[PDB]
Amino acid sequence: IRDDGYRLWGNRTLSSDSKWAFVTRVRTMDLVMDAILAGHKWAVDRGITKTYVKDVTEGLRAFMRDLKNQGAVINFEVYADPDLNSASQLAQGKVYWNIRFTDVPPAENPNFRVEVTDQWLTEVLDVA
Amino acid sequence: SFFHGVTVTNVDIGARTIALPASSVIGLCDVFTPGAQASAKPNVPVLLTSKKDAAAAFGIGSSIYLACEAIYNRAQAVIVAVGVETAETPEAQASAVIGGISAAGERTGLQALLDGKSRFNAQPRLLVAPGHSAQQAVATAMDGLAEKLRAIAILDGPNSTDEAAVAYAKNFGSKRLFMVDPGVQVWDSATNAARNAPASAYAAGLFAWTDAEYGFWSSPSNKEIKGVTGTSRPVEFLDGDETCRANLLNNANIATIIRDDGYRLWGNRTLSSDSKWAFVTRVRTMDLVMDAILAGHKWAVDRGITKTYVKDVTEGLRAFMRDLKNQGAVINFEVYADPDLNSASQLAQGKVYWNIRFTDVPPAENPNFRVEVTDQWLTEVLDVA
Amino acid sequence: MIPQTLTNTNLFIDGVSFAGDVPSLTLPKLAVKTEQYRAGGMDAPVSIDMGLEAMEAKFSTNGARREALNFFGLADQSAFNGVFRGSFKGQKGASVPVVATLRGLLKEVDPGDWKAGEKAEFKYAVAVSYYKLEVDGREVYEIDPVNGVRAINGVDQLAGMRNDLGL
Amino acid sequence: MIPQTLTNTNLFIDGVSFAGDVPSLTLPKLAVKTEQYRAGGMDAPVSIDMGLEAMEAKFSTNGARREALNFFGLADQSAFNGVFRGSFKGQKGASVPVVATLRGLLKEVDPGDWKAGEKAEFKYAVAVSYYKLEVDGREVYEIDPVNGVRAINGVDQLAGMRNDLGL
Amino acid sequence: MIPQTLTNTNLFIDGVSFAGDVPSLTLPKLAVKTEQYRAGGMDAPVSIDMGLEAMEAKFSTNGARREALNFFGLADQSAFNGVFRGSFKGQKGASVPVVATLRGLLKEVDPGDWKAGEKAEFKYAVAVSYYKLEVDGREVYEIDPVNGVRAINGVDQLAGMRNDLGL
Amino acid sequence: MIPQTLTNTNLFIDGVSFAGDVPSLTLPKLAVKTEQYRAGGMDAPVSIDMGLEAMEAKFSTNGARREALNFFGLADQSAFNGVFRGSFKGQKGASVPVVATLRGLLKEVDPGDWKAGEKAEFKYAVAVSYYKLEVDGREVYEIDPVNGVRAINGVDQLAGMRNDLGL
Amino acid sequence: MIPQTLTNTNLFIDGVSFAGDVPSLTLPKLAVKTEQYRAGGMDAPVSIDMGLEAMEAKFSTNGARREALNFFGLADQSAFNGVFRGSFKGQKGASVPVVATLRGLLKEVDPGDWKAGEKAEFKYAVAVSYYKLEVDGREVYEIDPVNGVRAINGVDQLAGMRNDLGL
Amino acid sequence: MIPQTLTNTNLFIDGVSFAGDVPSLTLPKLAVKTEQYRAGGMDAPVSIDMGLEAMEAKFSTNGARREALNFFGLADQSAFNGVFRGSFKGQKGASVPVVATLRGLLKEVDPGDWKAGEKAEFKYAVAVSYYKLEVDGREVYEIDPVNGVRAINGVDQLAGMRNDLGL
């Protein structure tokens, strides 16, 4: 936009969905998981014990409060899915978790409502 | 579409009106026109926290909004407002401000302010009907609803003389009524002149402002009404056992506005025929000592009666009452279970009694200066010595 | 007199009874803050009072007892209410109640060592912001630091300093 | 209430179970940092809170147990994870779990005296950087110093200071 | 005499009571301005008076307390009014009030270091333009520099200089 | 009143939060420049004001923290912006924010002694060119030396000298 | 796991075996030097590491044993070499060796009380300048203060500070 | 942020490493030379900059160390080169180097008291004629008085005065 070609300007991606409008939304969701996955590589081995599903949640919450600390998210929510953790799923090795979070919004449009008044035309410029 | 980057916009907005955020809730009822931009059904109460929220629900040219601007210039208060639609004759207008259950089953007019809690969690501690409380029928519906809702209704007299205010104040001997007779003369920006205003909403904004800085036990009787330029009649506070206009109206239990282009609300007597309930300090403190006691002991309506139920309420009542003696609301309370009326036949019905005697702080209504000019120190100085 | 001794204790935290799991109670030690005062014309100090000391009431449970764990470290100090009760027996059989309603901040939760076969005891301690001791249903002590009250037989000892400070 | 007492403990360090060799556990002592506050118009202090104290959880093994020795003194502080579990029994037979997931720095390893016929006990101590106590599967405590959180019934007590500091 | 000592303090700034948050008061140090006077026919100085020194009363709060922060640096000097009160106890229990009404300019506000766990203390200091000390409700001192008054038992010591200067 | 005390601090330099590494803050000491004024017909000085003193706000970090090191010694004085925040607690749990936005020149960076096992503390100090103190979100102080403004409750005390000087 | 416990100890000072007269050994207590770190935006300390503490290994003989007496107080510090060995048994019979080669200064020799019929015990203590703990023949610890090495599973934790200091 | 603290220091004088005997380092205190500037139409000073202060870096050894003793008092000022290094740890384990290459005159050698059993510490101090501070391998400061350079983020702040003086 400016100054002999100085600054990249837009931040919308080419999405037809307003839930995925910003590249902030797309990049954060993409790289919250790449930090979650690369960091929980022990969950594909390590055959299912009783506290397998508990040690992943507290591991998932711990590598997600590191993300709330540095400002990637705001007030995540991690919990094991209570409705889809069957034992028929567990014999197949499947076990589910829910990793809801909120992304930080970019300040896309700051709005300045500027007005010229004659209010302080008497407060100064007078004998007073 | 959207915008990326920073916008600038030339837009006229009129000189912000900073006020202390207050916790008191105010029940308001006046006329407006239900149109396009007015997003309020007529006999439906709405919760208001801003002048923008008053001008989005009601018209900016409405009489609701002029009453709500009258409150927001002094306190950032919560207003449960009921926009009664206008009518032709003043008999049918006063009938519509009073309202009733004359719907299918709904509540209209002032009676919709009883719906203020359970619609918005705002049970109105102040009742105001600006310009309509001058009629004797509305000011009785203000009375009986202030007794139900446990509030103080702020009335106003007519625009007429002092004797029309005194003779209108003799129609009421009620504890919960607080008349402010002289109207407010406020400068209108549109007509570029001074528009009248019925001064009930200016009292209610100051009545709720006093709860924020000074607490509900303080009187509002010398505080500053903001956003006003004068009164409808000049009110005269002088001394000398005279027929002062401020002293004539106080002895008819009417608060006035006394100095400096209409600067200060003045009286603090309510319209009571009992000298035990003369001051609004007495009426407001007893009303809001209990609303802090009740909202704080909501666990005593469930929690089936054990052995130490009656003891755990007294020590709970004493604990939420030494918080009131600490901040100065009372002076040396007394709380105890009633020993003569706590039967077991009462306890099978779920009834159990307590006695919550206290003493309210008196307002300094009449400071007296006994001034004397002497020639005593005519020798102590002015001499060779 | 009659030989009289405690036989039984009880605890009410927020109206809930701990009538199964409080092995030990401790009322706050009321100590006055003495300064040993030695001055002119005297060979020995005389111990003027300077106000009361800080009061802590401590008590232990040895089950889980969320009804006392949920009062630790609240933003509202002086929100832990609590009633320490004792029954003093007496030889002739006339049991005298000693009831100490108190209010303050639950200031430490001390889960001790957890050995397998050994009884595990949660030790708590409150920082007492209000204290009233009733013996035989009669007010002995009533100490409220803020709103300075020190009543010893229903007689407020701090009425002297209250008028001096204009409180 | 029902007379309730711990009967059994367990320890998970990094998912590995120590179900043979932990004779004693110790949950961190949650103490609030009180300052005894005596000021104008009052005869006794009142103990305002100033935040929490530093938490240490200590535990002992008495075998070799490299699965806990290999977490001492890492460059990554708050990398020792760990779950202290307890089973509180109760008289009627309703066992209530007390599970304390915690995270921090394993700050001292204390191999004691090694006498020949005597049992040798490795005493460890961790410097707790995160602590969540669940009783009967319900969150009692949740303390995270960085990202300042002090939840007492799921209710974050530090939401007041969080908006004040702009955190 | 009776061994007598302060036990309690209070502060009124503009009628508002600081009965929760003033840990320390300091009355102004009344010092006369001596000049050591050595002259003819004498081996030692004799210390003639030259008037009083400048009086500063300082006091500390450790909450926020806008009711004392809003008096700093006003255009109106001698507009900070203020009442320092003390209750001196005595061994026999006869509490004697020491009340020091004073007036002046709040000349420095010193918010100290703000460490996290440590109590933070706002130190104030006023520049005293009027000072009256009453002990047991009886005027001990009354110092008003402008309108030169130095009363010591109700007796104005400056009546000598007042007639000399024609004041 | 309610016993109220700071419990937590924070620092924003240029919008960046220092929510891990500022152990101590120091708001600028607002001192008025008094001259002790003794003149004719009076025995004691009276301390007329002569303007404010120079304000310095100092603060310490003890990590590396380039986000505060890069503001030392710029050509642009009054380019260090900065927000000192504090949370004052109160006994009833009503946390009151004390926020001091300030602007000036970061005038000294003091890396102290670097011993091996000892915590190393970078001490900074700014030369305050603008200072606004808000308590409970309400303007207490507003000091801007150039464009001479001294507001004490939103009330500019220097409107008197502003019309006299024709500013 | 398997219930595992030490049953037997041994000591090699300079290759010579003390297989008759060492009743007690003590490996050095590995403690990291924590500083409780409380700073902005947080209610609790967090305990950053500051390096290791000083290590002392102590051991006792109760014969004469010149083969350990002749290493006290040499000019060559870190010349006392020494191997503390332990055999941890296990319930199934799989004995696991715990061998702690260490090096340092034999810093105190404490011949205790010599009563006639009572066993007399020479208590020694070394000031550990190198320490390697092997469990089941696998390196757990390796601490060398000079040439700063802190290996925890063969992984040198001080490779971060080594490149920073240019060591 | 992450709680970050120095854990280790090092010193290179002339490429030789002092990795055994420097107990304390001190980087030079960068202070700008402020003059408190009060002038017309303003009530408070504003502290204009007047250049930097004189920089001294001091450090101590407590062995003999001719490799630092031989740089005292040479005819060649600014011939003492020297690199002060520090490793700031951080809670997550990311060690950040702080390296301060500096150059100047070793201006005082202070061998302290030599008591027999007490550690004797040679205190040195250099008069810094060039100073570059790199944090995480990135230039924070670069101060060269002759050839007037004051770079704060790689940005030379003295390019304004350099063109004015024709340097």
Side-chain angles (χ1 to χ4, degrees), chain E residues 56-78:
Chain E
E56 60 182 1
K58 62 177 71 68
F59 67 100
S60 67
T61 185
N62 53 9
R65 274 82 188 88
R66 291 179 62 248
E67 295 293 324
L69 288 173
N70 289 123
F71 290 97
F72 176 76
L74 296 176
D76 194 2
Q77 290 80 244
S78 68

Side-chain angles (χ1 to χ4, degrees), chain A residues 9 108-112 114-115, chain B residues 2 4-5 7-10 13:
Chain A
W9 186 239
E108 189 188 8
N109 193 7
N111 286 316
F112 289 161
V114 55
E115 181 189 4
Chain B
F2 58 90
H4 178 68
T7 66
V8 297
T9 301
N10 188 16
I13 42 100

Side-chain angles (χ1 to χ4, degrees), chain F residues 21-133:
Chain F
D21 277 329
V22 282
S24 65
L25 279 304
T26 301
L27 304 184
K29 179 171 75 72
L30 282 81
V32 79
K33 183 181 182 294
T34 61
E35 183 67 29
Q36 298 176 1
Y37 188 77
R38 171 79 173 272
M42 56 182 175
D43 59 343
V46 81
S47 292
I48 310 299
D49 292 339
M50 305 297 288
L52 287 178
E53 292 288 331
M55 299 181 290
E56 60 182 1
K58 62 177 71 68
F59 67 100
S60 67
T61 185
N62 53 9
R65 274 82 188 88
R66 291 179 62 248
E67 295 293 324
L69 288 173
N70 289 123
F71 290 97
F72 176 76
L74 296 176
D76 194 2
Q77 290 80 244
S78 68
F80 177 85
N81 50 7
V83 176
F84 291 4
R85 284 176 182 263
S87 177
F88 291 12
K89 182 65 180 293
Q91 189 185 4
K92 299 292 186 181
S95 63
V96 174
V98 178
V99 45
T101 169
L102 60 91
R103 185 174 294 272
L105 196 279
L106 179 59
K107 66 180 178 181
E108 67 188 1
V109 170
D110 190 3
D113 292 331
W114 283 3
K115 295 185 184 291
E118 187 176 358
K119 182 186 287 183
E121 185 179 3
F122 290 166
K123 293 185 186 294
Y124 301 152
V126 315
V128 175
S129 176
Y130 176 74
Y131 178 67
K132 183 172 77 174
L133 182 64

Side-chain angles (χ1 to χ4, degrees), chain A residues 26-46:
Chain A
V26 184
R27 191 88 189 282
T28 302
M29 182 269 173
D30 185 74
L31 290 172
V32 67
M33 301 312 294
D34 293 332
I36 280 298
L37 298 182
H40 292 293
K41 299 295 183 182
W42 57 270
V44 187
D45 52 352
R46 187 171 293 179

